[PDB]
Swiss-Prot record:
It comes from Escherichia coli O157:H7. A divalent metal cation 1 binds at residues 96, 107, 234. It is an enzyme of class 3 (hydrolase). One of its GO terms (biological process) is proteolysis. One of its GO terms (molecular function) is initiator methionyl aminopeptidase activity. The gene is map. This is Methionine aminopeptidase. The lineage of its organism: Bacteria, Pseudomonadati, Pseudomonadota, Gammaproteobacteria, Enterobacterales.
Length: 262
């Protein structure tokens, strides 16, 4: 059941993708020491609803109570925004946004460094983004997803970090999480050949320490087992005839929006 988007579908995804990217571009100036994650969530929500006239796909999903996911430091993913959680100098934080517009989803995330960065945090964020970019450069019709997961893993590991196994990229479109599962590591279980019109996300979570993770009692928050820092970046893409197009590209991305192979 891997859905192939029509040209019309892709046009709608381009819109939803840009909206999502825009939320991330917009929030930047607000990310400073002393701000709470609860406030960031409110600002995002307002923008999405009142300015963009869109909807957050997260709010209510399986009961998720907020509009975006904000994961600080050792929180891997799904961090829940809260008025009591204040950002400090040196924190690294991921803001993951998924917007729905005209029934199509746009899913993307990036890391932000609060105030003065630490050596580890900067490095970790950089390597994580680079691992995503590497993956994007490989995307093209005919290739097996497995190769992509394997490349990410090799890269990350060579740099002294680890890749989280449990969470993965996913198809996306009218549905939030569609087939297929996009693994960020090498697995003999993976056997999917890419074809034009497929749309999915790549969103590697990398840990400064060991790969092990743990789910909190809240049922959402995921943290590293060894409390090391964790970083993630995400983009939604569409496979094209000779490469791919990045639907959630932002002003700060340093990769071209269209990647062509020849
Ligand atoms: C708690 S919903 C998490 C969704 C997230 N935006 C993803 O990439 O799947
Ligand atoms: Co996401
Ligand atoms: Co995603
Ligand atoms: Na984090």
């Amino acid at each position: 059941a891997i859905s192939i988007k029509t040209p019309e579908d892709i046009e709608k995804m381009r819109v939803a993708g840009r909206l999502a990217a825009e939320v991330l571009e917009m929030i930047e100036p607000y990310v400073k020491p002393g701000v709470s994650t609860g406030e960031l969530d409110r600002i995002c929500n307002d923008y999405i609803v009142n300015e963009q006239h869109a909807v957050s796909a997260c709010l209510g999903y399986h009961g998720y109570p907020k509009s975006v996911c904000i994961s600080i430091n050792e929180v891997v993913c799904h961090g829940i925004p809260d008025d009591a959680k204040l950002l400090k100098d040196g924190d690294i934080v991921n803001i993951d946004v998924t917007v729905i517009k005209d029934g199509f989803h746009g899913d993307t995330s990036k890391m932000f460094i609060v105030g003065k960065p630490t050596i580890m945090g900067e490095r970790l964020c950089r390597i994580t983004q680079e691992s995503l970019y590497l993956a994007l450069r490989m995307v093209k019709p005919g290739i097996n997803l497995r190769e992509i997961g394997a490349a990410i893993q090799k890269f990350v590991e060579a740099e002294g970090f680890s890749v989280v196994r449990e969470y993965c990229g996913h198809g996306i479109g009218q549905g939030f999480h569609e087939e297929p599962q996009v693994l960020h590591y090498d697995s003999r279980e993976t056997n999917v050949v890419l074809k034009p019109g497929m749309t999915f996300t790549i969103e590697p979570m990398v840990n400064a320490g060991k790969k092990e993770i743990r789910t909190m009692k809240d049922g959402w928050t995921v943290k590293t087992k060894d409390r090391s820092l964790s970083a993630q970046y995400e983009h939604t893409i569409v496979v094209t005839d000779n490469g791919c197009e990045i639907l959630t590209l932002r002003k700060d991305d340093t990769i071209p929006a269209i990647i062509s192979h020849d």
